[PDB]
Every structure is written in structure tokens, then in C-alpha cells.
Design a binder for this molecule. Structure first.
Ligand SMILES: Cn1c(=O)c2c(ncn2C)n(C)c1=O
Lengths: 241, 41
């Protein structure tokens, strides 16, 4: 941070802060490009994964910058810019899950992306820790969050949907609903199963039914629809929780 | 008391029977509106 012993010095932490700012801006405009066509080619995906790896790595650096409770590091970070880049990240994620909620192409990058969210919020809580009364830096975080509160909604309720509907799918309109319970439960079988539950909105449950991916006639697997990422999503939501 | 659910003067010395319609409105839209109300009466 300081490098006191020499005549002159720099603060390299500010340098990496602005570097990831530039990185963030780049990824956001990449989203702005892909935000209209939404039929994303191989190329943008595979380079984008590498950009994701950059974001992962720089968050790893960031975390280990605040690996301990190093205070003046937190002070510089409190006066640093970076929060806006986080806000833009949330904005990316919010729409990003929805376009990435579709295909075998999507789910890899989606997994990396929700991984990146997890690492980013790990970074956030790791720099959080030094609070006492209500946390001046925590007040700052509240400002950032309830500022960007709207795009927080999409990701959190997406988590809610994917979590509670991997939870629902055990039985009592599911396993006895067919003889086997493999997932030969049809599309509208599960749809009216949801209706008999009457828990969620029809819109996003039928959106899930759109992401049921049409198992060759009407049916839908139990794990392979939701769980295989939902429990990763459970980990992620646990972190944010 | 699984056999008293449908009974007519159900709080015959307690309070009031409007609580039956009240919990119909608590639950019948979820599961069965005319089913559970008729299950009560
Ligand atoms: C009908 N009724 C009530 O509804 C009631 C009550 N005490 C409280 N409630 C609410 N008593 C004594 C009562 O007779």
C-alpha cells in the first residue's frame, strides 16, 4: 500500500482498482453488444470465459489484499472507486442469468459467472469484517446496495425460484405423480403441479417450463432441470445470505 | 376430531362460526375453495 522506505512511492492497490474498473466497463459493453441478439456464438463465449478468468483472478488478488484485517488497506478501499464497478457487475448478472438460463451453451459460462459473483461477494465480505457498531464502511455498502437494489431483485428472486423449485420436486405432486419418478412427468403435468402448489408466480414458473427444454415429448428430468446448478446456486445464495 | 370437522353447529358453546369462513379464506384459494368449504359446510 504505502512503500514508505524509499524517497517516492506508489499505491499499487489503487492501480489495480482502476484496472478492474476498466475491466468492468469492458465486460459491461460486451453485455450491451450481446444484449440484443441473444444468440451467442461460440467465439464470444470462449473468449468471454477467458475474460471471466481475468475477473476471477483479479478478485483473488483483491481478496488476498484484504486477506487479513489490514486496516489502512480498507481505508483506501473505502475511499476507492470500486463500488460502482460492483454495481455494474450486479447489473450484468441480473440480466445475464436470464439469457444464460437457456441452453447447454449457456450453462457453462453461467456457472463461471455465478462463480464470479460468489468470489466477488467473498471479496466484499472479506473487506467488510472490521465493523463494530454499525459499520461506516457497512453504511457505505448499504448505500451501494440499496442504491442498486433493483437489479439485486432479479438475481435474488431467481435464486429463490431455482432453490425452492429444486426443493419442491420431491413428491406429493411429483414422485407419485408418475409411477417411476424419473422425470417422465410431462410439461403441463409439472405446470399444474405448480398450480396445485400455488406458491410462485405463473410467469417465472412457466419460464422455468420454458427452460424445461422439451424432453422429446413433454417430460422433464428432476435433477437435470434444476438441481445440478441449483445447489451451486444454493452455495452462492448462502454466501450472499 | 377428524370426524368433527364437518359438523354444523361447530362451536356450539365456544365463540363463533365465522372463523370457519375465515380460514377458508386463509386456505381455500390455495387448495380447494369449494372443496374445503363444503368439507366444513
Ligand atoms: C364470542 N367470544 C369471542 O369471540 C371472544 C371472547 N373472548 C375473546 N373473544 C375474541 N369471548 C368471551 C366470546 O364469547
Amino acid at each position: 500500500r504505502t512503500q514508505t522506505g524509499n524517497n517516492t512511492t506508489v499505491n499499487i492497490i489503487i492501480s489495480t482498482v482502476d484496472y478492474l474498473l476498466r475491466v468492468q466497463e469492458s465486460i459491461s459493453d460486451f453485455y450491451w453488444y450481446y444484449s440484443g441478439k441473444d444468440v451467442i456464438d461460440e467465439q464470444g463465449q470462449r473468449n468471454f470465459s477467458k475474460a471471466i478468468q481475468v475477473a476471477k483472478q483479479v478478485f483473488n488478488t483483491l481478496t488476498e489484499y484484504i486477506q487479513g484485517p489490514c486496516t489502512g488497506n480498507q481505508q483506501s478501499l473505502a475511499h476507492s472507486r470500486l463500488w460502482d464497478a460492483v454495481v455494474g457487475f450486479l447489473h450484468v448478472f441480473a440480466h445475464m442469468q436470464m439469457k444464460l438460463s437457456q441452453d447447454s451453451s449457456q450453462i457453462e459460462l453461467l456457472k463461471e459467472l455465478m462463480d464470479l459473483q460468489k468470489d466477488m461477494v467473498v471479496m466484499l465480505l472479506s473487506m467488510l469484517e472490521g465493523n463494530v457498531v454499525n459499520g461506516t464502511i457497512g453504511k457505505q455498502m448499504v448505500d451501494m446496495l440499496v442504491e442498486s437494489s433493483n437489479n439485486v431483485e432479479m438475481i435474488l428472486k431467481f435464486f429463490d425460484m431455482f432453490l425452492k423449485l429444486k426443493d419442491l420436486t420431491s413428491s406429493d405432486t411429483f414422485k407419485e405423480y408418475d409411477p417411476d419418478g424419473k422425470g417422465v412427468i410431462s410439461k403441463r403435468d409439472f405446470h399444474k403441479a405448480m398450480e396445485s402448489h400455488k406458491h410462485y408466480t405463473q410467469s417465472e414458473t412457466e419460464f422455468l417450463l420454458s427452460c424445461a427444454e422439451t424432453d422429446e415429448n413433454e417430460t422433464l428430468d428432476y435433477e437435470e432441470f434444476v438441481k445440478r446448478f441449483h445447489e451451486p446456486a444454493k452455495d452462492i445464495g448462502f454466501n450472499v445470505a | 376430531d377428524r370426524l368433527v370437522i364437518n359438523t354444523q353447529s361447530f362451536p356450539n358453546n365456544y365463540w363463533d362460526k365465522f372463523v370457519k369462513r375465515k380460514v377458508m379464506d386463509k386456505y381455500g384459494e390455495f387448495y380447494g375453495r369449494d372443496r374445503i368449504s363444503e368439507l366444513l359446510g
